[PDB]
């Protein structure tokens, strides 16, 4: 009862029906694994800007 | 500032007086007098331009 | 002002090698005579390939030492003197070196004992000219020019002009 082992036949036709799904833009903007110092620098400014924005809200 | 260790100076053994003597030429101004006490021509051979300039040890 | 002074031959290295097929006891005696003749401890050469025909790897076969300066010249004089300043024309290498072998080492003759024994020694002399250091130094190593390099006939002429030892062609 030997059988055919493998074939790539019809595989490209199948893969192109619903064509190659591209990744979304948000996939290229991930930050995990970035430089430790650059993350430390970015977080410091974001905290500074947010705290300065919030005191303006309290003022007005 | 240059990174280093004090294990490859003229001291790295004995003490700062051994390093200070070499920096000030004590080793140089001890072979001039050693050669003088051994041979006059040997003295003129190695330090010939020092007598010409009159630089005493 | 001629630069011939920069072209004067001078014996820069003289290697004396004693080869014995066994290690231990007799090797120490072979190293002992070398120390007396020169004044520095020799180096015991060990075998590279073990061959049962010669009954020899890690075992030390031969000992040798090299001398330079006035010591090499005076040691070489004894070797040529005991050779009667007779050197064959085929002993001189194409690179300007030469050598020979000595059967009986004179060393000491009064108190020769079987404990010391008798040993055969070979003398190999390496000739050089000023400026050969460019191939020996650590920084900016190069090759000496062919015209500056020593050939066979310069070595042969030097032996005739420094020791008056004729050459043998037969």
């Amino acid at each position: 009862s030997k059988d055919k082992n493998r074939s790539s036949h019809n595989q490209s036709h199948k893969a192109h029906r619903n064509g190659f799904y591209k990744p979304k833009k948000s996939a290229y903007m991930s930050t995990k694994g970035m430089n430790v110092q650059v993350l430390k620098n970015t977080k410091a400014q974001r905290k500074f800007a947010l705290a300065k924005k919030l005191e303006a809200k309290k003022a007005a | 500032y240059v990174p280093h260790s004090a294990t490859r100076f003229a001291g790295a053994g004995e003490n700062e007086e051994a390093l200070r003597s070499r920096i000030l030429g004590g080793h140089v101004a001890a072979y001039m007098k050693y050669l003088s006490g051994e041979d006059a021509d040997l003295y003129k051979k190695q330090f010939g331009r020092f007598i010409a300039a009159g630089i005493a040890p | 002002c001629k630069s011939d002074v920069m072209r004067k031959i001078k014996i820069d290295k003289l290697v004396l090698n004693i080869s014995v097929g066994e290690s231990g006891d007799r090797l120490t005696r072979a190293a002992k005579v070398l120390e007396t003749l020169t004044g520095q401890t020799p180096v015991l050469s060990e075998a590279r390939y073990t061959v049962r025909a010669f009954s020899i790897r890690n075992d030390q076969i031969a000992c040798h030492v090299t001398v330079r300066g006035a010591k090499a010249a005076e040691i070489l004089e004894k070797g040529l003197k005991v050779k009667e300043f007779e050197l064959k024309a085929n002993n001189f290498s194409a690179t300007g070196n030469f050598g020979f072998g000595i059967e009986e080492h004179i060393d000491l003759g009064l108190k020769y004992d079987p404990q010391v024994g008798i040993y055969g020694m070979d003398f190999f002399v390496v000739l050089a000219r000023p400026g050969f250091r460019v191939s020996r130094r650590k920084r900016m190593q190069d090759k000496i020019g062919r015209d500056h390099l020593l050939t066979k006939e310069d070595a042969i002429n030097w032996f005739k002009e420094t020791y008056e030892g004729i050459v043998l062609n037969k």
Binding site: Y21, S30, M34, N35 | - | -
Partner: protein, 165 residues
């Protein structure tokens, strides 16, 4: 039937270029990579540590992170029926700056050179220059007249067959 080793079928891919063995340039370790740059991943088999997978060889990616010794490169990988984003950290030995935007970055500078003169010609009131014409595929050549003074004719005909032997 191949095996499934990490560096299978790499006799010729990982072989160094002819007469190109040994140490590499110092421009490889001195080039400055900034986030957003375009680089080409080139597996240098002379350096076995950190060797990128052979499937990324010759692919053009973008720098997304810069670390003290490695450069974060981002490439697109084709999977069953989708494309995924692969984020590698490769030492500068195995990457190389890409010229994929060489022509584009010149056209960017050419239009900015004209734009610089435009903001100055507007102050003086003179007409302002137009932006460079866009690239087009080879267009049909126009009608041109050929002078007969320096013309020569050579007849072209089928050739009589001659046996090579």
């Amino acid at each position: 039937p191949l095996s499934n080793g990490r560096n299978r079928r790499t006799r010729k891919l990982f072989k160094r270029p002819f007469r190109g063995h040994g140490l590499s340039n110092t421009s490889t370790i001195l080039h400055t990579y900034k986030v957003g740059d375009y680089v080409t991943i080139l597996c240098n088999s002379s350096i076995q540590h950190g060797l990128p997978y052979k499937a990324f060889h010759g692919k053009t990616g973008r720098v997304w992170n810069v670390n003290p010794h490695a450069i974060g490169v981002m490439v697109n990988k084709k999977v069953n029926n989708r494309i995924v984003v692969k984020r590698l950290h490769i030492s500068p030995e195995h990457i190389k700056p890409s010229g994929c935007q060489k022509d584009f970055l010149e056209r960017k500078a050419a239009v900015a050179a004209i734009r610089k003169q435009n903001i100055q010609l507007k102050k003086e009131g003179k007409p302002l220059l137009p932006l460079p014409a866009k690239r087009l595929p080879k267009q049909p050549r126009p009608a041109e007249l050929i002078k007969g003074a320096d013309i020569k004719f050579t007849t072209v005909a089928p050739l009589k067959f001659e046996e090579l032997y």
